[PDB]
Design a protein around this nucleic acid. Sequence first.
RNA 1: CCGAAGCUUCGGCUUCGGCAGGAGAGGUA
DNA 2: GCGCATGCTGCTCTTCAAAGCCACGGCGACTGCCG
DNA 3: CGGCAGTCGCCGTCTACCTCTCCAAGAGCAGCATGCGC
Lengths: 49, 48, 110, 195
Amino acid sequence: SRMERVVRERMTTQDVEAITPQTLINIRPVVAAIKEFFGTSQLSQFMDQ
Amino acid sequence: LYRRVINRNNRLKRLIDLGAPEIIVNNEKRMLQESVDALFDNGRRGRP
Amino acid sequence: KNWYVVHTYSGYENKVKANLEKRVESMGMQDKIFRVVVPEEEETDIKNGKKKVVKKKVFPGYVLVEIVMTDDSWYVVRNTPGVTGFVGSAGSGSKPTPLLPGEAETILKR
Amino acid sequence: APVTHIWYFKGVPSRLGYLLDLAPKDLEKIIYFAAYVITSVDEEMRHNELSTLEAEMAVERKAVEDQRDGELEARAQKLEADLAELEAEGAKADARRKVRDGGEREMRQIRDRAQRELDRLEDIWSTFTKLAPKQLIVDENLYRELVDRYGEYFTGAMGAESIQKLIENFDIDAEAESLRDVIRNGKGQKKLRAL
RNA sequence: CCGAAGCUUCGGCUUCGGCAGGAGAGGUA
DNA sequence: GCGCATGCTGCTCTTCAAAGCCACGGCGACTGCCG
DNA sequence: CGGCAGTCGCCGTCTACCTCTCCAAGAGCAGCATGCGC
């Protein structure tokens, strides 16, 4: 959803005929969410061995 | 919280000693008041 | 038609001006907004002859913007990637207060 | 610029509001730049200028009436002329009935505009006759008008600099004996508020 | 305050070197 | 050979937006609401 | 005016000890550095 908001907001400030799917998409929010869940979270717990 | 207070105070001083319109000065004064309020007690009014 | 004020973050006045001038037409409203003016002046300084003219914005953080008032103009000039709000909102911000003729003229006359 | 300590205004209760006799919402509005307040009012100069101000106000009253009747005479001129020249030559006067309703609503358009102006003047005058200190006033328009026409005699602003003035111009003894007088002979809930 | 090194009259003197806060999860009595 | 213009890298800010998620008891002001 | 009852915010909710992990990142502004042109 964060990436979708970014692409919607940036689709109206660039010039047409130079817009490609690779220039509208930002990966940083998705990787940030993944690495924030698998680290500092209350449900992904240190395993006891 | 000290850095925020100092930054707002410096911006307010420079804008006052420049001949700014009343709306902008009022906005800066409101923002300085909020910063000091957050310094003394954070979360009492509004959001933390 | 009045002159209003907008509040950007810090250093993003010229990027808010650019994005707004682009979204004037790209979006679809060429008769609502009219003129965007980022107040600017000069600064006397030289380095043994070579000049610099520091970009001392006479109002760091604000961008006056001539605009009419509807319910789609507010939307476009409030979601621009950079603006923070409509400085002037004195009371639930239900109708931003416009800049006063005099002050607007003496700011533009610089 | 002066600021206000949070402990003495956002508490339970509000000690600043108890000292100044102001509701906490009113204090929050004044402090955070959302409404005005009247610090002082020179009543001697609002006494030895009364009938003179009333005469100038009657001058503007008459001038607004003259404007109204001027353009009412010229609108009825245009009307009368065009309507009597083309009073539905041949057919039924459905065009002159459409412009009958439209001309009656044009007369009542300029009439409600002159009524609106009469109301503006009436309220301006009333407020300038009922202006006591520590009275909150909203709506920038009205304030600006009062400060343009009757600029002097009345002083006030918003922010903590305007609360410093209220605190500075405060008399502890008079209010203290007033509260003791209220507690001495009183009942209901005003006694509880005084306590 | 501690360590290293010099003078040391044995009281000490001099040089250099060196830090320690928050949030979350699980457990024992 | 000298003067013009544009690009490597330290280096220093910057943070209004807005949808999100939803015990229990005691106490005291308060505030719109009904009469 | 005068009562009035819901309501909304703020206060509080045992002690001592052990082990582990994680704690701002993207945007922008100079200070020269060098290639190229006449």
